[PDB]
Design a protein around this ligand. Structure first.
Ligand SMILES: Cc1cc2nc3c(=O)[nH]c(=O)nc-3n(C[C@H](O)[C@H](O)[C@H](O)COP(=O)(O)O)c2cc1C
Ligand SMILES: Cc1cc2nc3c(=O)[nH]c(=O)nc-3n(C[C@H](O)[C@H](O)[C@H](O)COP(=O)(O)O)c2cc1C
Ligand SMILES: C=C(C(=O)O)c1ccccc1
Ligand SMILES: C=C(C(=O)O)c1ccccc1
Ligand SMILES: [Cl-]
Ligand SMILES: [Cl-]
Ligand SMILES: [Cl-]
Ligand SMILES: [Cl-]
Ligand SMILES: [Cl-]
Ligand SMILES: [Cl-]
Lengths: 357, 356
């Protein structure tokens, strides 16, 4: 079963091709994680997945999506992640983390408490390339960033990467997708700047390439440096947007990116996304083949046969399974059993495996 | 769905009828639990089960089944349970614990390391009589004196007291599966001629005296339960079952709040008819004749089987063990499988919102 093939990238070996993608828990307070996250991540790690990417972690307080989002903007925040790393490693899984800045989609309520912008002593001004609201349920207009804002946020990403390294993460992912800060710099929908960071393809790519280059300097060369990146919007410009996105991926690769998590942009709400099980499969394959970068992707791979089929077709190097690990922390064990893998129960630690054969 | 109906017993209310039975993890060190147990228990509790009974916890070092078994024979051992209790409560589940003495079946290797009598890690075992279990447990126990019986009863009391102070809201005496209490009740293993063997009253005495002693420190408003093997499948089933139900009646008169109905496993010469929910009709008969609430286990991981046993009034609580090892969130799976409305809110909000 290709799903249960190990995977080596730089000095890191994953015991199988199942990755748990980042999924915010909306349970931290002032960015500090707690007992919720500890049990949550240690449990999925024991489930058998080879890689576990911790949820989107803000590099700065205004970079949080919500007041419940994890943060790593101070050394105290970094230290709280230390026992999460040790517990993921102790389970045999690889700890990774996604560091993020929500840009103009920040200052929002938790999804089960409105899922929209905060009107309210809990709100904060947001920043983005240009002062243009997302629209829909995020109508707050962001402040357009100055050159000093750009230098500061890049340094936040560097500090977040450095803290992540020192906490023991072995895998880092820059959040350049889903309409957040990095994504909003790349898209013409959101970036109307006329300085060095807007207009041309080179200028729109600049924020992302510079942030990657700064992180490359503190992130160890022997540990995978990856990014999640929205390569099309389904906005009626997909062939053009896909071509630019793949070219940027080529510049990511020249800049030391080791793997790309292929996603959708979500930069604006006026879209027609063709949701379906594994619908990203063919987009990720094209990115993998044209930019010659390993990839992962997500959405609907919780059906084990779909995950297997995506790997055997070389559309993916890793399969990311999110909501299914929320439903079942031990989904990897379910998948090994579902795919007839030999000694499927030994995907779990011995206190479970011995009794489930 | 009756499986997702709350249940009240003394001052404790369970949010549904799903109980996680005690399941030893073989991951403790000299009886001390650690980060393995903390995440193991907090995760299953977040899965939605209403009651979570912590694994068999030794009241004394020689009462461990294996060297990886939890213990509660000191205050340091009890304090280690505090964060497990608190995490179970924080998830909305009820923490219980099974306190135990393995008797003549102790000093054994972990199931994945031989599963047989133990080597510098072994120890002398005690039992009513100096008679080995047999099979892969051939070490002969030391027969207990009256002073031994007084010691072990006080161990159960001290364990109950520690359990209370750690915050458990539900206690289970392990009088099943061939361990010390079970071996005192069975004629197969109890050949004593003093006040603790021979007649039915004498064979019951240790169990009734341990229960009464535990009752003195265990709060009256928190469920006091026991797990008890009511038959052996040893060719003496109607006689054994009738005696076992009689003892259950005396347990009830002695303050037992619920009975976890199991098989004795006192000797190896048996023909147990394993099958899905096979204990159902045994538990129903005990429930009806002893007029006590009951739970039972073995094969209720099929949600429809759990629902059927509750609707038939064979059980008050359904114990689901191995399915919660495979899937810590089994309660949510059972809710979805049985068409329960807002099934995803069996889980906490960070999960429930996304599974609607
Ligand atoms: C609760 C939840 C939180 C999410 N948080 C993040 C996040 O922190 N970062 C991210 O890039 N994607 C996030 N996602 C998207 C997932 O990583 C993934 O792309 C998506 O769930 C599709 O995979 P699935 O079908 O296996 O769930 C989130 C999804 C869910 C359900
Ligand atoms: C790993 C494991 C450990 C167990 N440990 C205990 C224990 O500590 N005490 C006990 O009385 N029963 C113990 N049992 C029995 C379970 O409580 C339960 O009755 C049995 O597994 C049947 O239920 P199930 O079919 O849902 O797993 C254990 C079973 C397993 C598989
Ligand atoms: C943080 C998220 C992201 O990266 O878009 C997210 C959060 C909830 C659902 C989907 C995605
Ligand atoms: C401690 C146990 C018991 O109560 O007999 C146990 C341990 C392993 C498997 C079944 C049961
Ligand atoms: Cl564009
Ligand atoms: Cl490649
Ligand atoms: Cl399963
Ligand atoms: Cl008998
Ligand atoms: Cl009754
Ligand atoms: Cl499920």
């Amino acid at each position: 079963s290709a799903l249960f093939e190990p995977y080596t990238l730089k000095d890191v070996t994953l015991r199988n091709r199942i990755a748990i993608p980042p999924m915010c828990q909306y349970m931290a307070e002032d960015g500090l994680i707690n007992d919720w996250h500890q049990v949550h991540y240690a449990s999925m790690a024991r489930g058998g997945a080879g890689l576990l990417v911790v949820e989107a972690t803000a590099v700065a307080p205004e970079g949080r999506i919500t007041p419940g989002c994890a943060g790593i903007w101070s050394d105290a925040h970094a230290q709280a992640f230390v026992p999460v790393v040790q517990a993921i490693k102790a389970a045999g899984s690889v700890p990774g983390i996604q560091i993020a800045h929500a840009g103009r989609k920040a200052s929002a309520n938790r999804p089960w408490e409105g899922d929209d912008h905060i009107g309210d002593a809990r709100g904060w001004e947001t920043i983005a390339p240009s002062a243009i609201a997302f629209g829909a349920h995020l109508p707050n207009v962001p402040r357009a960033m100055t050159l000093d804002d750009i230098a500061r946020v890049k340094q936040d990403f560097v500090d977040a990467a450095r803290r992540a390294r020192d906490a023991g993460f072995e895998w880092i992912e820059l959040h350049f997708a889903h309409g957040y800060l990095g994504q909003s710099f790349f898209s013409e929908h959101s970036n109307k700047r006329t300085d060095a960071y807007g207009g041309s393809f080179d200028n729109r790519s600049r924020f992302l390439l510079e942030t990657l280059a700064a992180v490359r300097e503190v992130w160890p060369e022997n540990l995978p440096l990856t990014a999640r990146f929205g390569v099309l919007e389904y906005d009626g410009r997909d062939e053009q947007t896909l071509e630019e996105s793949i070219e940027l991926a080529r510049r990511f690769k020249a800049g030391g990116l080791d793997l790309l998590s292929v996603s959708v942009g979500f930069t604006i709400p006026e879209t027609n996304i063709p949701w379906g099980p594994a619908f990203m499969g063919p987009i990720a394959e094209r990115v993998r083949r044209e930019a010659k970068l390993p990839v992962t992707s997500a959405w609907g791979f919780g059906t084990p046969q779909l995950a297997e089929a995506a790997l055997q077709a070389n559309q993916l190097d890793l399969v990311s399974v999110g909501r299914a690990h929320l439903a079942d922390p031990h989904w990897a064990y379910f998948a090994a059993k579902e795919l007839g893998v030999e000694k499927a129960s030994w995907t779990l630690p011995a206190p479970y495996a011995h009794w489930l054969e």
